[PDB]
Amino acid sequence: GSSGSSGKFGELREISGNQYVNEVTNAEKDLWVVIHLYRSSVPMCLVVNQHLSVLARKFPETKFVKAIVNSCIEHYHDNCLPTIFVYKNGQIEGKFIGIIECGGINLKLEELEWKLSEVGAIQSDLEENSGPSSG
């Protein structure tokens, strides 16, 4: 059966690197943490954040957070951002690397609202599949 997951959050917050883990990694059990790395240099991200702003109040269950790649990763050299990662129980529910992979400079508020859904972070309306991973 079901009980009723009460909302606790309702806004977009920012976390530090060392926190990314203790936060996302060490996140709750039945919680969906969706992080989105943005950079004042990359335009795509800027737009991705806009959706995350309204998507935060729409889905309080899913923990949304943003962090800068300023001395956070090594490998990351170029042609990587935007980058989005979905963590549920300390794993990678869904990752998105590349402007295109993240929808594109022409990404709509609905398009992205689905990506996170198809993964299991949220429940969008956009046409979805029976269940490749979620089930």
Side-chain angles (χ1 to χ4, degrees), residues 56 102 115 123:
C102 271
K115 296 209 202 78
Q123 46 285 291

Side-chain angles (χ1 to χ4, degrees), residues 101-129:
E101 298 207 27
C102 271
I105 53 77
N106 59 82
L107 160 77
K108 280 150 175 73
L109 177 80
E110 288 210 305
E111 270 275 311
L112 177 56
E113 185 189 313
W114 170 44
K115 296 209 202 78
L116 308 159
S117 151
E118 54 158 62
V119 177
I122 55 171
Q123 46 285 291
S124 187
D125 284 328
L126 283 273
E127 32 164 313
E128 69 274 304
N129 299 106

Side-chain angles (χ1 to χ4, degrees), residues 5-118:
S5 53
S6 304
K8 297 268 87 268
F9 319 141
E11 69 205 58
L12 177 72
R13 282 186 273 277
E14 169 191 311
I15 60 164
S16 285
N18 194 287
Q19 296 278 66
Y20 171 113
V21 176
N22 283 271
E23 290 312 279
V24 191
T25 309
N26 277 269
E28 211 43 54
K29 207 81 75 210
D30 304 80
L31 172 81
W32 288 84
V33 180
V34 177
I35 193 157
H36 159 246
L37 309 153
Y38 81 114
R39 280 210 307 179
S40 164
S41 44
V42 197
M44 207 313 166
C45 309
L46 288 165
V47 178
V48 185
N49 204 292
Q50 301 275 114
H51 312 309
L52 287 167
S53 168
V54 70
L55 282 163
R57 79 185 280 85
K58 190 152 178 66
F59 311 100
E61 279 296 311
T62 293
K63 204 169 163 80
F64 300 93
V65 299
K66 75 273 207 69
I68 312 170
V69 191
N70 188 345
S71 203
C72 273
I73 312 281
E74 297 158 52
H75 295 275
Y76 270 67
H77 70 94
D78 207 50
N79 185 21
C80 273
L81 283 178
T83 290
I84 302 170
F85 302 114
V86 190
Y87 281 76
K88 163 70 151 57
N89 270 288
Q91 87 181 98
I92 298 185
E93 300 296 73
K95 84 209 305 274
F96 318 65
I97 302 86
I99 290 170
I100 304 88
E101 298 207 27
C102 271
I105 53 77
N106 59 82
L107 160 77
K108 280 150 175 73
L109 177 80
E110 288 210 305
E111 270 275 311
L112 177 56
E113 185 189 313
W114 170 44
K115 296 209 202 78
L116 308 159
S117 151
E118 54 158 62

